[PDB]
Design a protein around this ligand. Structure first.
Ligand SMILES: CCCCCCCCCCCCCCCCCC(=O)OC[C@H](COP(=O)([O-])OCC(O)COP(=O)([O-])OC[C@@H](COC(=O)CCCCCCCCCCCCCCCCC)OC(=O)CCCCCCCCCCCCCCCCC)OC(=O)CCCCCCCCCCCCCCCCC
Ligand SMILES: CCCCCCCCCCCCCCCCCC(=O)OC[C@H](COP(=O)([O-])OCC(O)COP(=O)([O-])OC[C@@H](COC(=O)CCCCCCCCCCCCCCCCC)OC(=O)CCCCCCCCCCCCCCCCC)OC(=O)CCCCCCCCCCCCCCCCC
Ligand SMILES: CCCCCCCCCCCCCCCCCC(=O)OC[C@H](COP(=O)([O-])OCC(O)COP(=O)([O-])OC[C@@H](COC(=O)CCCCCCCCCCCCCCCCC)OC(=O)CCCCCCCCCCCCCCCCC)OC(=O)CCCCCCCCCCCCCCCCC
Ligand code: BCB
Ligand SMILES: C/C=C1/c2cc3[nH]c4c(c3C)C(=O)[C@H](C(=O)OC)c4c3nc(cc4[nH]c(cc(n2)[C@@H]1C)c(C(C)=O)c4C)[C@@H](C)[C@@H]3CCC(=O)OC/C=C(\C)CCC[C@H](C)CCC[C@H](C)CCCC(C)C
Ligand SMILES: COC1=C(OC)C(=O)C(C/C=C(\C)CC/C=C(\C)CC/C=C(\C)CC/C=C(\C)CC/C=C(\C)CC/C=C(\C)CC/C=C(\C)CCC=C(C)C)=C(C)C1=O
Ligand SMILES: CCCCCC/C=C\CCCCCCCCCC(=O)O[C@H](COC(=O)CCCCCCCCCCCCCCC)COP(=O)(O)OC[C@@H](O)CO
Ligand SMILES: CCCCCC/C=C\CCCCCCCCCC(=O)O[C@H](COC(=O)CCCCCCCCCCCCCCC)COP(=O)(O)OC[C@@H](O)CO
Ligand SMILES: CCCCCC/C=C\CCCCCCCCCC(=O)O[C@H](COC(=O)CCCCCCCCCCCCCCC)COP(=O)(O)OC[C@@H](O)CO
Ligand SMILES: [Fe+3]
Lengths: 273, 50, 28, 260, 36, 51, 51, 48, 36, 50, 50, 50, 51, 36, 50, 50, 36, 50, 50, 36
């Protein structure tokens, strides 16, 4: 039940709230107060999803859709079958995400680690909040948020994009996509480099950090470095959502036209017509 | 009977935490589910009837 | 006219009232 | 009538969907998780209820060991049979009888090396360059390395502890000669004839001085000692870093307590 | 049970009432006895 | 030796106070619910077409 | 040496309190379900055209 | 801390008793539910 | 079975009722005997 | 009753703060749910009946 | 009989917690699936019957 | 004959867990697949017949 | 030491109980399938136009 | 089999019933015999 | 024969696991492939005949 | 050995493995005959087929 | 085979049935022999 | 000949696993490519004939 | 040996590997003949073909 | 071969049959003869 090196690290303390009340492990999982709240929200939200799906038109796993209220309801609580279940599950999801992040804070305090992982987890939480809370607040109702369903939230993404006639021309989207592609490519490069150094071939020697620097200085003329590649990976992954949020929040509240026309700021400069 | 020996291995703290979570979630689930119906909602004015 | 003799009032009274009794008669 | 049809309601894409899932889950469960089990396994149950297989046999969840042939010398295996057992007699007592119950230090955890102050049983060898020289060395022993022009030189700066009390003076920087990266500050600690290394990550450095939230000034005296003056072993690096990390949770009792 | 005008008058004699009671009462009894 | 530090005298004191306070809180909740019922009897009788 | 830290006597005391609490909780659940049934008999009899 | 033979026998006895009691009350409950809703309908007229 | 008007009257004699009972009753028996 | 021994293993202070947070959340849920109905809303003008 | 020896290698608590979670999931699946039907839903007014 | 030696190699604990998971998966596949048909669905009112 | 940690005697006892349980499960499956066939004879005879 | 009305009357003599029984019964025998 | 020497290099546990997975995948492929045809589906009402 | 089996364990496992594989394939042959009796899946060459 | 009315009557004598049996039987035999 | 010397070099484990995967992929390709045609499909009712 | 065996186990493995491969290919030949009897899959040159 | 009504009668004498056999049989031989 313990890793062979684990026992010396399982010490008390580091909790944000609860102290010794919930400071314990269940199998490998650390629990804590926010582990308790995470299990509460997870069980409640998944059970509400289950019951609400049972009352929808299809029970095919990919066709299940729990949708927010109509726009007319504004911010009011909706009848459960007409958006109220979506509201409850949204609240449960937010509680679960925040509980998970805070439990990560407690775990990293216990291990003497930097808080980089819960802080990084803050970014997708913030994007979820932009999609489901902040932009709906600016647009004037919970009905602007995305529904819960494997394929139905894709329908929402699709129609949201085409509400601005081509979402590809959104500059925030262009930045976000560039970071997504750069991050996937950089992860491929980094995993490949570490594996190549540790696994040269048949009976060949594990190489060194100088070999890591030499490989990329040969191939592209630059090597960012061992610590710096992890910094860069975190930077690119975070900037996917950090720069996407600007395009998302702007679409509607700050821009009602097609996104291609936004580039009129450049195209229509009077100097070059 | 030796049923009490269960508490020599099962840690009342973790058991009580789990049962508290479990029962509260199930109670909330059942109340929500009933309030979502027409036939068994006890808060709202009755609907689903002619 | 909601009164003490409304039958359905026993339902909230039963859920609130029964445990309050044995809570005081078991743990105390 | 249609390309891609295999029956009335069977088509190629439908089968390829399940084939894709098979590829994904075979790679994950049959290969990747086995790779994940090359450290810390087989698992141990100090307070278990049942008998597990002996730690010295290939018990089924264990991958077959692979051999890393080191650049400068011998071989290591993964899983490593020599790192399988840990023997240090940790100064920790149970707060409760079960394994899921946290342990409590029996006194001075930072010195003992438990919790966030735990250090791993690394090899007691000096990490080296690909040319065979010691990788991490003070600038006094590596005159060919220097601070880049116009960057803050921290030698001569006062070092203050977490309590704002002055703890020492920076005497040297330790550079990683393979990576060209500064990794340690050497500190002459006030009140003794003794130097303490500190990872550069625990230092907030300004032109006025360096500040260390991790430990109190008085605790700089108990930093683990290097056996040699101008080189450091891997285990020594672990011990020195873990001392300040343990201070992050143990420097004062308040640091181990919750907000509410 | 149904009244004359099709109206509901619940009682202990409703057969369907013994589905919940059975599900709730039966374990409650043998939980009280088995682990005593 | 107790993980909370209580001394079986503090524990008995807290248990007495806590059980009394829980029963008291449930009782005032009961009274408040009765007042609310006199304002709004929230469990309506079975409607005519209900089955 | 117990995994839970409880002695034999504390295990027996906890067992008695736990089983009593569980049985009382389930018994008040049974009573409450009966009262609710008198308010709303939730399992309707087999309707006319039901197969 | 490992389980002893006596403890193993005691747990096994109670575990089997609990499982059998659970399955038997499930059997009775399913009979009652059948009396409320006979859920496996007979073969319909055109069923082949 | 079906009543004189086609309405269903559940009973212990219903043939299909012995599918669930059989699935639940049979293991319950041999779990009890084989193990303790 | 030996029930007081529970407080030798549960730390009354932490139990009370967790219970306070839970009960606050439940009370907010119930108040808001009632205010989301026509029949039992006590803030708004009576809606949902002729 | 020797079946009790299973508990010397299988960790009774693992079986108990696994069964608890597993049977909870199965019971929820069955209840929700039944409520999804017209013929066997026992909460709402009867549907799918002319 | 000597088939019992399989449990000196194959780890009864892992086999029991794997069989539990596997048979659960197969049973769920069959039950839900049958429920997805008209002819062999035993929950809903009969579909697909004249 | 065996790979599983069992002894030869434990291996034999587990093997006997495992085979008995497996055979009993398969046999009750056979009986249950016959009963389900009496409810729903799921393999229909070759239809008229079938080839 | 098919009755005079044509409705299916499930029976033990149904030929197709021995596809599942055969698939289930046959291994159950030799599993019970090869390993015992 | 010397075929038994295969198990001195092939790790019977992993062979048995891979064979279990392989045969299960083939069986699911065939059963659900046949259920995906009109001609050889044995669950649904017959389709594709005049 | 590389797998940690002895010689006689390898021989016994090989014997039982081959017997089990042969019995599985033989019952597959019998089952395929029975299924053919139910559904003769390889139809004769039809009228216009070339 | 094709009955005189033109309907299918499966039998052990159908030629096509020996495509699967042959595919299943032939290896089964030599697997039984080669590795014994 | 020197053919056997290949197995002093070529790692028979890797060869067998790669060959098993290769042949399985080819067999799947052929079976399902044949089913993709009207002419050589043996599962479904005959299609594509005058 | 550069890859594990004992220079005679390699001869044995080569012998069995080649015997297995030949048996597999030969039964494939026979099976292809049987399939041809069922479906003569290489049609003669059609009338207008060039 | 082709029959009177144009129906195909497969046989060992079909010429095209020896394209697959050729592709299969020829390597099988010079493998078995030359790599064992
Ligand atoms: C809703 C949320 C449900 C969460 C349920 C949690 C239940 C955990 C539990 O009961 O554990 C008891 C168990 C008891 O602990 P213990 O008795 O101390 O340990 C016994 C063993 O000695 C120690 O065992 P071990 O450490 O060797 O365990 C390995 C681990 C194996 O874990 C994994 O394999 C993780 C798989 C990663 C999936 C990667 C997905 C990415 C690739 C696909 C991407 C798709 C793109 C489109 O666990 C398992 O063996 C499988 C557990 C089966 C339950 C999974 C549900 O604790 C655990 O085993 C912890 C592992 C649980 C990990 C959860 C993995 C969740 C994966 C879901 C995502 C998949 C998406 C598809
Ligand atoms: C080409 C590209 C190349 C690269 C380009 C450049 C790279 C850029 C990216 C670089 C990598 C990312 C850098 C992030 C570094 C963050 C870090 O080092 O944190 C470790 C550090 C660990 O602390 P420590 O040294 O262990 O503290 C001593 C003890 O823990 C004693 O601590 P204590 O008990 O005194 O602490 C009490 C604490 C108690 O605070 C809390 O418990 C609340 C924590 C909340 C959870 C974290 C939420 C983070 C939300 C982020 C959302 C991101 C998206 C939002 C939209 C933008 O209250 C606070 O310290 C401040 C309250 C909020 C803290 C957050 O965490 C912090 O102290 C807070 C740093 C936050 C700064 C950034 C926040 C954004
Ligand atoms: C949590 C607690 C929830 C309790 C809910 C109580 C409730 O539903 O009231 C039923 C109550 C009983 O009505 P009922 O006779 O069953 O229904 C027939 C008509 O509705 C009755 O005719 P009405 O609607 O004109 O009601 C007349 C109203 C006349 O009462 C007044 O003069 C003003 C009421 C108190 C003003 C605010 C009190 C602030 C001090 C606390 O109430 C009385 O007759 C009681 C007179 C004695 C003064 C009560 C002061 C008690 C304070 C403790 O209906 C009311 O309209 C009285 C409302 C009482 C004030 C509302 C709650 C005040 C909370 C202040 C918290 C400050 C911190
Ligand atoms: C026709 C419409 C289109 C469209 C509509 C669109 C919209 C409206 C938006 C984007 C956005 C985005 N698009 Mg774009 N899209 C992108 C890629 C992207 C992303 C880079 C970016 C951010 C995604 C995001 O915010 O997820 C959000 C993901 C979140 C929030 C994850 C939250 C996770 C949570 C915290 C944790 C959840 C945990 C689980 C519940 C737990 C699971 C438990 C386990 C155990 C089972 C590409 C590469 C392309 C291409 C190839 O053309 C494209 C085309 C389109 N997009 C179409 C043109 N897309 C967003 C953006 O930033 O735009 C500027 C955005 O708003
Ligand atoms: C820019 C940085 C990014 C980033 C970063 C990081 N990501 C992290 C961490 C960091 C740093 C962690 O530390 C944390 C973790 O532990 O990792 C292992 C985590 C995790 N990232 C997950 C999912 C994930 N990351 C996505 C995106 C990015 N991640 C981007 C790219 C996406 C996308 C894009 O779809 C997904 C789906 C989980 C696997 C895990 C959270 C577990 C959780 O929260 O537990 C608590 C909650 C649950 C286990 C379930 C809660 C279920 C609710 C109650 C009911 C469902 C509600 C829901 C709204 C329904 C949706 C329906 C759907 C069809 C529409
Ligand atoms: C092990 O650590 C790692 C490094 O340091 C040793 C890397 O340099 C790298 C390579 C990363 C980089 C060089 C930065 C990312 C940019 C890349 C790969 C291509 C961009 C083009 C250039 C850098 C050319 C610059 C020339 C001027 C990786 C992936 C890594 O994992
Ligand atoms: C825990 C909290 C965590 C997550 C919950 C988050 C909930 C967010 C809700 C979003 C909005 C929901 C909208 C809604 O549906 O709110 C109301 C119902 O929900 C409701 O309160 C349901 C409220 C349930 C009340 C009963 C709860 C009793 C539980 C007791 C056990 C818990 C005790 C735990 C103590 C530690 C609406 O009532 P309806 O009868 O449908 O009215 C329909 C009318 O509009 C028609 O005209
Ligand atoms: C959290 C998950 C929530 C999803 C919903 C879970 C609720 C349980 C639903 C049980 C459904 C039973 C069922 O029947 O499952 C079948 C397969 O679904 C399925 O695997 C449903 C998916 C089951 C996943 C279980 C995994 C464990 C679906 O067929 P039907 O429902 O007839 O088709 C619905 C239509 O006829 C419309 O009326
Ligand atoms: C669990 C296991 C699940 C595993 C499933 C795997 C099953 C894969 C089956 C793929 C079979 C592909 C064979 C295609 C084929 O055999 O088709 C042939 C042509 O292929 C052509 O050109 C060329 C066709 C090939 C194009 C390239 C396709 C690449 C991707 C296909 C496979 C991806 C699978 C990925 C799995 C992760 C013959 O077709 P025609 O007679 O001209 O058509 C006539 C029809 O219109 C009328 O009847
Ligand atoms: Fe890395």
């Amino acid at each position: 039940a313990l890793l062979s090196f684990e026992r010396k690290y399982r010490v008390r303390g580091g909790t944000l709230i609860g102290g010794d009340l919930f400071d314990f492990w269940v199998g490998p999982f650390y629990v804590g107060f926010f582990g308790v709240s995470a299990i509460f929200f997870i069980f409640l939200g998944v059970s509400l999803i289950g019951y609400a799906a049972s009352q929808g038109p299809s029970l095919d796993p990919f066709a299940i859709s729990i949708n927010p209220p109509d726009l007319k309801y504004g911010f009011a609580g909706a009848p459960l079958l007409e958006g109220g279940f979506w509201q409850a599950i949204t609240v449960c999801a937010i509680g679960a995400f925040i509980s998970w992040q805070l439990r990560e804070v407690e775990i990293s305090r216990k291990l003497g680690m930097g808080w980089h992982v819960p802080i990084a987890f803050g970014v997708p939480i913030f994007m979820f909040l932009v999609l489901q809370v902040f932009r709906p607040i600016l647009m004037g109702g919970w009905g602007f948020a995305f529904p819960y369903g494997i394929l139905s939230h894709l329908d929402w993404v699709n129609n949201f994009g085409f509400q601005y006639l081509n979402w590809h021309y959104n500059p925030g989207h262009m930045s976000s996509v560039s970071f997504l592609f750069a991050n996937a490519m950089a992860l491929g490069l980094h995993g490949g480099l570490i594996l190549s150094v540790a696994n040269p071939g048949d009976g060949d020697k594990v190489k060194t950090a100088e070999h890591e620097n030499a490989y990329f200085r040969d191939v592209v003329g630059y090597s960012i470095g061992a610590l710096a590649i992890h910094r860069l990976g975190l930077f690119l992954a975070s900037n996917i959502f950090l720069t996407g949020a600007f395009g998302t929040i702007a679409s509607g509240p700050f821009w009602t036209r097609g996104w291609p026309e936004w580039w009129g700021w450049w195209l229509d400069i009077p100097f070059w017509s | 009977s030796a049923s009490w020996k269960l508490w020599l291995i099962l840690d009342p703290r973790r058991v009580l935490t789990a049962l508290f979570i479990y029962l509260t979630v199930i109670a909330l689930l059942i109340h929500f589910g009933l309030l979502s119906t027409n036939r068994l909602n006890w808060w709202e004015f009755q609907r689903g009837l002619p | 006219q909601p009164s003490i003799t409304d039958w359905n009032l026993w339902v909230p009274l039963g859920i609130l009232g029964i445990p309050t009794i044995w809570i005081a008669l078991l743990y105390r | 009538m249609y390309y891609g049809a295999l029956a009335n309601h069977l088509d190629i894409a439908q089968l390829a969907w399940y084939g894709h899932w098979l590829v994904i889950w075979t790679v994950v469960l049959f290969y990747l998780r086995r790779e994940d089990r090359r450290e810390g396994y087989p698992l141990v149950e100090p307070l278990g209820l049942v008998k597990l297989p002996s730690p010295d046999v290939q018990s089924g969840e264990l991958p077959y060991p692979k051999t890393f042939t080191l650049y400068h010398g011998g071989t290591v295996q993964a899983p490593n049979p020599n790192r399988r057992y840990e023997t240090r007699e940790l100064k920790l007592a149970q707060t409760d009888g079960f394994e899921g119950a946290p342990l409590a230090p029996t006194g001075n955890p930072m010195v003992d090396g438990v919790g966030p102050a735990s250090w791993a049983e690394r090899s007691e060898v000096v990490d080296s360059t690909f040319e065979g020289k010691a990788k991490i060395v003070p600038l006094r022993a590596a005159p060919e390395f220097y601070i880049a022009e116009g960057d803050l030189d921290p030698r001569g700066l006062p070092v203050f502890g977490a309590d704002g009390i002055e703890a020492g003076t920076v005497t040297d920087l330790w550079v990683d000669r393979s990576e060209y990266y500064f990794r340690y500050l050497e500190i002459s600690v006030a009140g003794s004839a003794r130097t303490a290394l500190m990872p550069l990550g625990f230092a907030s450095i300004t032109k006025d001085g360096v500040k260390v939230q991790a430990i109190l000034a008085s605790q700089f005296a108990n930093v683990p000692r290097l056996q040699s003056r101008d080189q450091i072993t891997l285990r020594e690096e672990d011990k020195v870093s873990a001392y300040y990390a343990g201070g992050l949770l143990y420097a004062t009792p308040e640091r181990a307590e919750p907000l509410l | 049970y149904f009244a004359a005008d099709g109206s509901v008058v619940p009682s202990i004699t409703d057969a369907n009432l013994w589905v919940p009671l059975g599900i709730l009462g039966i374990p409650t009894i043998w939980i009280a006895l088995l682990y005593r | 030796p107790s993980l909370t530090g209580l001394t079986e005298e503090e524990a008995k004191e807290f248990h007495s106070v806590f059980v009394s306070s829980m029963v008291l809180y449930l009782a005032t909740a009961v009274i408040v619910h009765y007042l609310v019922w006199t304002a709004r009897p929230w469990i309506a009788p079975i409607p005519k077409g209900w089955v």
